[PDB]
Design an enzyme around this catalytic site. Structure first.
Site, short mmCIF file in Angstrom:
data_model
loop_
_atom_site.label_atom_id
_atom_site.label_comp_id
_atom_site.label_asym_id
_atom_site.label_seq_id
_atom_site.Cartn_x
_atom_site.Cartn_y
_atom_site.Cartn_z
N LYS A 116 0.83 -1.20 0.00
CA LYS A 116 0.00 0.00 0.00
C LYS A 116 0.87 1.25 0.00
O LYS A 116 1.40 1.66 1.03
CB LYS A 116 -0.93 0.02 1.22
CG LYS A 116 -2.04 1.06 1.12
CD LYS A 116 -3.08 0.87 2.22
CE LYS A 116 -4.22 1.88 2.09
NZ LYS A 116 -3.76 3.29 2.29
N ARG A 137 -8.07 11.74 -6.89
CA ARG A 137 -9.27 10.99 -6.53
C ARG A 137 -10.34 11.93 -5.98
O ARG A 137 -11.53 11.74 -6.24
CB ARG A 137 -8.92 9.92 -5.48
CG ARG A 137 -10.04 8.90 -5.21
CD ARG A 137 -9.69 7.96 -4.05
NE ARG A 137 -10.08 8.54 -2.77
CZ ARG A 137 -11.26 8.32 -2.17
NH1 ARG A 137 -12.16 7.52 -2.74
NH2 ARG A 137 -11.54 8.92 -1.02
C1 LIG Z 1 -9.06 -2.03 -4.10
C2 LIG Z 1 -8.88 -0.50 -4.05
C3 LIG Z 1 -10.24 0.23 -4.21
C4 LIG Z 1 -10.78 0.12 -5.65
C5 LIG Z 1 -9.76 0.71 -6.64
C6 LIG Z 1 -8.44 -0.08 -6.56
C7 LIG Z 1 -7.85 -0.01 -5.12
O1 LIG Z 1 -6.64 -0.79 -5.04
C8 LIG Z 1 -5.53 -0.20 -4.51
N1 LIG Z 1 -4.34 -0.75 -4.73
C9 LIG Z 1 -3.20 -0.22 -4.24
N2 LIG Z 1 -1.98 -0.82 -4.50
C10 LIG Z 1 -3.28 0.97 -3.46
C11 LIG Z 1 -2.10 1.67 -2.86
O2 LIG Z 1 -0.95 1.25 -3.02
C12 LIG Z 1 -2.34 2.87 -2.10
C13 LIG Z 1 -3.62 3.34 -1.93
N3 LIG Z 1 -4.72 2.71 -2.47
C14 LIG Z 1 -6.07 3.29 -2.23
C15 LIG Z 1 -6.62 3.89 -3.47
N4 LIG Z 1 -7.06 4.33 -4.42
C16 LIG Z 1 -4.60 1.53 -3.23
N5 LIG Z 1 -5.66 0.92 -3.77
#
Ligand SMILES: C[C@@H]1CCCC[C@@H]1Oc1nc(N)c2c(=O)ccn(CC#N)c2n1
Ligand SMILES: NC(=O)c1ccc[n+]([C@@H]2O[C@H](COP(=O)(O)O)[C@@H](O)[C@H]2O)c1
Length: 313
Positions: A116, A137
């Protein structure tokens, strides 16, 4: 003396060659040529653009230094919403997530696990290969249009090799070293420091003078698409490969995990690898790998049911 006719052709050659070197250096983090090779070609290109400014194009690498100053940011709608993540904070939380997923799907399920990235969520729209919008976003259905700023972010391609129309999403962030460097610069010039790299990235993307943004050393990892279409991936892990393939920077540390136990092992692995990373992470994101299973689980109002963020305390 170089003619306009000769210049026009040469500039494209230079753009192509310089952009390829830039792809290798900024996206694959693995330059092939020595910097002086790049610098010499880049100067030749600057000379041509200086002499014939009409030859300057949006995908020319000289535009990375920016120049535009905005009065403000336009609203940037996300017709396909950008959700956020449900959180877990314990081993138990993660196993409960897996238990709920299996209950819903009716079988064991594989997870794509990703670090993350502690930064800001971004959306990048391309038309026929051309970068045409970048957006934060925001509140999930409307962010800010920061197209001009993102043009200065070196890992963001201005033209993809294939004229694909797609909108990809990921994280934009500031590496630790750049964070440290930037705070020192702020100390020197009497400014308040940023509390962390996430805040430094956010303040940077909020700057209206693109020339300052170009200096802030921001980077990206892309991890999904809003609208697929020409994309052929059927699993997240495939999506990450496909994103790399079409020319985006992706985080190399992902793993396809075949059991929740493998997932917990990944978490512990990178929980201890954490400080060695050149960037800050605030946890691990666990995603149901098969897109067909993601669809079956659907979304709450806030978040997908097919993913969860394990947050480091
Ligand atoms: C599953 C979620 C919600 C739907 C869209 C895709 C998202 O996936 C994702 N992957 C990541 N590697 C990261 C990340 O590294 C850092 C923050 N976010 C939050 C955001 N936006 C991540 N969200
Ligand atoms: N292929 C390469 O070795 C390569 C590519 C892009 C930038 N660079 C280096 O990065 C620095 C800044 O370059 P740009 O502002 O053109 O992105 C320079 O020192 C340049 O030599 C090297």
């Amino acid at each position: 003396p170089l003619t306009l006719t000769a210049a026009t052709t040469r500039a494209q050659e230079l753009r192509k060659q310089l952009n390829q070197y830039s792809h290798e250096y900024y996206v694959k983090d693995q330059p092939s040529v020595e910097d002086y090779v790049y610098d010499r070609l880049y100067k030749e290109l600057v000379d041509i653009e200086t002499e014939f400014p009409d030859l300057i194009t949006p995908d020319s690498p000289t535009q990375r230094v920016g120049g535009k100053v905005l009065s403000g940011f336009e609203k940037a709608p996300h017709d396909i919403p950008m959700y956020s993540l449900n959180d877990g904070f314990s081993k138990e939380d993660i196993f409960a997530f897996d238990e709920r997923v299996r209950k819903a799907i009716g079988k064991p399920v594989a997870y794509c696990c990703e670090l993350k990235i502690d930064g800001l969520a971004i959306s990048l729209r391309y038309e026929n290969g051309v970068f045409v919008r970048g957006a934060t976003r925001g509140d999930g259905t409307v962010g800010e249009n920061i197209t001009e700023n993102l043009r200065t972010v070196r890992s963001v391609p201005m033209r993809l090799t294939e004229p694909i129309s797609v909108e990809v999403r990921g994280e934009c962030y500031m590496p630790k070293q750049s964070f440290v460097a930037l705070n020192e610069e702020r100390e020197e010039n009497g400014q308040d420091i940023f509390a962390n790299p996430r805040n430094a990235a956010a303040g940077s993307l909020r700057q209206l003078d693109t020339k300052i943004v170009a200096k802030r050393n921001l980077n990206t990892f892309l991890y999904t698409v809003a609208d697929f279409g020409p994309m052929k991936a059927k699993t997240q892990f495939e999506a990450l490969e496909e994103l790399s393939a079409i020319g985006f920077r992706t985080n190399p540390e992902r793993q396809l995990c075949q059991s929740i136990d493998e997932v917990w092992a990944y978490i512990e692995e990178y929980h201890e690898k954490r400080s060695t990373l050149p960037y800050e992470i605030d946890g691990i994101v666990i995603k149901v790998n098969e897109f067909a299973l993601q669809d079956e689980l659907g979304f709450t109002v806030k978040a997908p049911r097919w993913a969860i963020a394990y947050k480091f305390p």
